[PDB]
């Protein structure tokens, strides 16, 4: 016979001891551990709600991969990617290039907690988290790998984060700030709670669903399986949050959440918004990016924050409004600057689409529809050279994303500047600037693409030089997804 898991589980996490040959601070340095005055005994209250043991882990995961890799191989010589909508294909290349290596990097984020968390249970769950991310990184390199011969763009599933292409810099700016350069407790708050539980867990669910609609059962299965692993480690932040509130650290906890959520939002608006609102065919659009956010992200955050006795972010009112524009700018920005990304941005501004955008968003054509009105005319009046840039867009020093807001009649684009120690910074939002001011020494000497351009680090100092600096060349350089097919509609 065998024991019931409940009878011996606590012993797997009864591993803390009183150091003697070295001091507690030496063994657990604050910069890595982040115990924040809270004692070892107090941290031991940490108790993950979802429990699992080694034998169970290797057994379940073995099965998940058997299925996933089996699906992939069965549909391998089917070449769906070929006869699939350019909007979808482009969606995948964007996903992989931005996520593969970051998934892997997260394995080190977990490893950070596995070694330096004073909470024994967090240390073990982080070890499983470490293995989860090791999996995601590998499986999301193995899958796109099947398409390297169809286009060099697929090579970016591995190369993107190794370049200085703006989106890559944006991705790294976020991740390094949330999970790679923060102490153990901070990581559980900002990555596992704020980002993995708050966004990616439900996101991946929709991606998998949408991928299913598209007819890509290989990619659908991929994301479905990976998503089932998320909760297992995403759970690590709640307990840390209770411990901090439980003790005298509610404020410190409060802003990590404030900061982490905004930053997750910014990066989220450029990579997910454009996707379900423009790259997705019209007859396959369930709800709008705004609808999706309110019903699957906004609500949960409110519920969650409530249960942990935390307050809604100070910027929450503004954040709620931006759901009506931010991802619209980000999109237009990416499509306009289409040759500077590794995937083909879709316009998604056909007659029907443009109205769809009007139903979901009040007065879209009176603002966003404007800019698109022009661009569409130039393409109708054979002047394609006016739909691409000849200059760099101003960049937010925090999210390293273009500073863009409401256009057209209801114009409102703003720039929340800030001068600190003989230097002028630019932020595409009030929250973005705030993230900077609450801790300057952390972002101070960093520099976005523009700062580098102005310092002479991009040479030659012209378009061709910037392209070569971002490691981009024809073949991978972006252009309109449907090859401008959507123009024949306007003559």
Partner 1 sequence: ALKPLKTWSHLAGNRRRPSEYEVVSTNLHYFTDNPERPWELDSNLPMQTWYKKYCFDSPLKHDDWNAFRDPDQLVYRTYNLLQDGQESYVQGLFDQLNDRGHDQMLTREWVETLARFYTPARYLFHALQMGSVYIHQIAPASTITNCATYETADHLRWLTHTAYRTRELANCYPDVGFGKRERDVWENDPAWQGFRELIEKALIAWDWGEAFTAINLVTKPAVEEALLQQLGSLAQSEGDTLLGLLAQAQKRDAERHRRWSSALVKMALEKEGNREVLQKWVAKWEPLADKAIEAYCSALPDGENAIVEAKSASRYVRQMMGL
Partner 2 sequence: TFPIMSNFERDFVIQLVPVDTEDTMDQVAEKCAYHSINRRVHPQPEKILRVRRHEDGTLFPRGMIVSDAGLRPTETLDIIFMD
Ligand X SMILES: Oc1ccc(Br)cc1
Contact set with partner 2 (CB under 8 A): 329, 332-333, 336, 368, 370-375, 378, 386-387, 389-394, 402-409, 411, 413-415, 417, 419, 424, 426, 450, 453-454
- Asked if residue 102 binds ligand OH (CB under 6 A), the reply is no
Name the residue nearer to its own copies (CB basis): 104 or 143. Answer: 143
Please confirm whether the linkage preceding 460 is cis (ω < 30° from 0).
yes
**Strand, coil or helix: what is 419?**
strand
Name the residue nearer to partner 2 (CB basis): 336 or 434. Answer: 336
Is the distance from CB of 445 to CB of 423 less than 8 angstroms? no
- Asked if residue 456 binds ligand X (CB under 6 A), the reply is no
Cα dihedral sign, 266-270-275-277: positive
Is the distance from CB of 245 to CB of 253 less than 8 angstroms? yes
Residues making up the chain, counted from first to last: 491
As given in the structure block, the two tokens for residue 491 are: 């003559």
Binds 442: which of ligand OH, partner 1, partner 2, none (CB < 5-8 Å by kind): partner 1
Closest CA to 297 of 275, 278, 273: 273
Name the residue nearer to ligand OH (CB basis): 104 or 279. Answer: 104
**Strand, coil or helix: what is 134?**
helix
The secondary element (H helix, E strand) that includes residue 464 is helix 463-469
Q: Considering only residues 248, 389, 440, 460, which one is a binding residue for ligand X as defined by CB under 6 A?
A: 389
Closest CA to 122 of 181, 40, 194, 44: 44
Q: How far is the CB of 346 from ligand OH (least distance, A)?
A: 27
Stretch that binds Fe ion, among 9-17, 83-91, 130-138, 356-364 (CB under 5 A): 130-138
Q: Considering only residues 63, 307, 483, 485, which one is a binding residue for its own copies as defined by CB under 8 A?
A: 63
- Asked if residue 448 binds ligand X (CB under 6 A), the reply is no
- Asked if residue 58 binds its own copies (CB under 8 A), the reply is no
For residue 402, the 8-state DSSP code is B
Query: Could you tell me how many residues of this chain bind Fe ion (CB under 5 A)?
Result: 3
Question: Which phi and psi (to 5°) does residue 343 adopt?
Answer: -130, 165
Q: Considering only residues 109, 130, 466, 481, which one is a binding residue for ligand X as defined by CB under 6 A?
A: 466
List CB contacts of 46: < 8 A, sequence separation 6 or more: 117, 119, 120, 121, 122, 239, 240, 243
- Asked if residue 176 binds partner 1 (CB under 8 A), the reply is yes
* Residues 113-172 contacting ligand OH, CB under 6 A: 132-133, 136
- Asked if residue 301 binds partner 1 (CB under 8 A), the reply is no
Q: Considering only residues 36, 118, 136, 405, which one is a binding residue for Fe ion as defined by CB under 5 A?
A: 136
Distance between CA atoms of residues 437 and 440, nearest Å: 6
List CB contacts of 432: < 8 A, sequence separation 6 or more: 262, 266, 396, 397, 398, 399, 416
- Asked if residue 173 binds partner 1 (CB under 8 A), the reply is yes
Query: Could you tell me how many residues of this chain bind its own copies (CB under 8 A)?
Result: 13
Q: How far is the CB of 204 from its own copies (least distance, A)?
A: 16
**Strand, coil or helix: what is 124?**
helix
For residue 418, the 8-state DSSP code is E
Task: Confirm or deny that 103 is annotated as ligand binding.
Answer: yes
- Asked if residue 81 binds partner 1 (CB under 8 A), the reply is no
Task: Confirm or deny that 196 is annotated as ligand binding.
Answer: yes
Binds 136: which of partner 2, its own copies, Fe ion, none (CB < 5-8 Å by kind): Fe ion
Name the residue nearer to partner 2 (CB basis): 119 or 375. Answer: 375
Is the distance from CB of 40 to CB of 27 less than 8 angstroms? no
* Residues 471-490 contacting partner 1, CB under 8 A: 473-476
- Asked if residue 217 binds its own copies (CB under 8 A), the reply is yes
**DSSP-assigned letters across all residues of 118-178:** S-HHHHHHHHHHHHHHHHHHHHHHHHHHTTTTT-GGGGHHHHGGGS--HHHHHHHHHHIII
Question: Per-residue contact track with Fe ion, 168 to 207, x per CB under 5 A?
Answer: ----------------------------x-----------
Question: Which phi and psi (to 5°) does residue 418 adopt?
Answer: -165, 135
Alpha carbon 364 to its chain's center: 26
Q: How far is the CB of 221 from its own copies (least distance, A)?
A: 5
Closest CA to 205 of 282, 292, 273, 134: 292
Binds 368: which of Fe ion, partner 1, partner 2, none (CB < 5-8 Å by kind): partner 2
- Asked if residue 95 binds Fe ion (CB under 5 A), the reply is no
Rg of the chain over CA atoms, in angstroms?
Answer: 23
Residues forming contacts to ligand X in the complex (CB under 6 A) are 2, 54-55, 85, 87-88, 91, 95, 99, 203, 206-207, 210, 213-214, 267-268, 271-272, 275-276, 279-281, 284, 292, 340, 389-392, 462-463, 466
Residues forming contacts to Fe ion in the complex (CB under 5 A) are 103, 136, 196
């Amino acid at each position: 016979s065998m024991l019931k898991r409940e009878d011996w589980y606590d012993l797997t996490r009864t591993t803390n001891w009183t150091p003697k040959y070295v001091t507690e601070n030496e063994l657990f340095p604050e910069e890595m551990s982040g115990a924040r005055g809270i004692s070892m005994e107090a941290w031991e209250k940490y108790d993950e709600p979802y429990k699992i043991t080694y034998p169970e882990y290797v057994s379940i995961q073995r099965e998940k991969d058997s299925g996933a890799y089996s699906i992939k191989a069965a549909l391998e010589r089917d070449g769906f990617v070929d006869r699939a909508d350019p909007g979808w294909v482009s969606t995948m290349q964007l996903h992989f290039g931005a996520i593969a290596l970051e998934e892997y990097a997260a394995s080190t984020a977990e490893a950070r907690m596995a070694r330096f968390a004073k909470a024994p249970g967090n240390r073990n769950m982080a070890t499983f988290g470490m293995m989860d991310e090791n999996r995601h990184g590998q499986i999301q390199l193995y899958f796109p790998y099947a398409n390297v011969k169809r286009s060099r763009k697929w090579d970016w599933a591995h190369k993107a984060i190794h370049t200085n292409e703006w989106a890559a810099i944006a991705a790294r700016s976020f991740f390094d700030d949330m999970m790679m350069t923060r102490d153990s407790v901070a990581v559980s708050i900002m990555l596992t709670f704020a980002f993995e539980t708050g966004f990616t867990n439900m996101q991946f669910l929709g991606l998998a669903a949408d991928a299913a609609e598209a007819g890509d059962h290989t990619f659908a299965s991929l994301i479905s399986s990976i998503q089932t692993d998320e909760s297992r480690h995403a759970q690590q932040g709640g307990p840390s949050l209770k411990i901090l509130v439980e003790n005298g650290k509610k404020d410190e906890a409060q802003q990590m959440v404030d900061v982490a959520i905004w930053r997750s939002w910014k990066l989220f608006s450029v990579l997910t918004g454009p996707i379900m609102d423009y790259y997705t065919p019209l007859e396959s659009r369930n709800q709008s990016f705004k609808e999706f956010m309110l019903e699957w992200i906004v609500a949960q955050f409110e519920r969650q924050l409530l249960d942990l006795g935390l307050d809604k972010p100070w910027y929450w009112d503004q954040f709620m409004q931006d759901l009506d524009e931010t991802h619209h700018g980000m999109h237009l920005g990416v499509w306009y600057w289409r040759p500077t990304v590794w995937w083909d941005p879709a316009a998604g501004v056909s007659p029907e689409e443009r109205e769809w955008l009007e139903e979901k968003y009040p007065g879209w054509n009176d603002t966003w529809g404007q800019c698109w009105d022009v661009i569409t005319d130039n393409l109708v009046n054979g002047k394609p050279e006016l739909t691409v840039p000849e200059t760099l867009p101003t960049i937010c020093n925090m999210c390293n994303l273009p500073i863009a807001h409401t256009p057209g009649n209801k114009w409102n684009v703003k720039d929340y500047q800030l001068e600190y120690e003989g230097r002028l910074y630019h932020f595409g939002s009030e929250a973005d600037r705030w993230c900077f001011q609450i801790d300057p020494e952390r972002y101070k000497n960093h520099t976005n693409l523009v700062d580098r351009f102005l310092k002479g680090e991009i040479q030659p100092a012209d378009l061709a030089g910037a392209l070569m600096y971002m490691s981009l060349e024809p073949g991978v350089m972006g252009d309109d997804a449907h090859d401008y097919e959507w123009v024949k509609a306007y003559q």
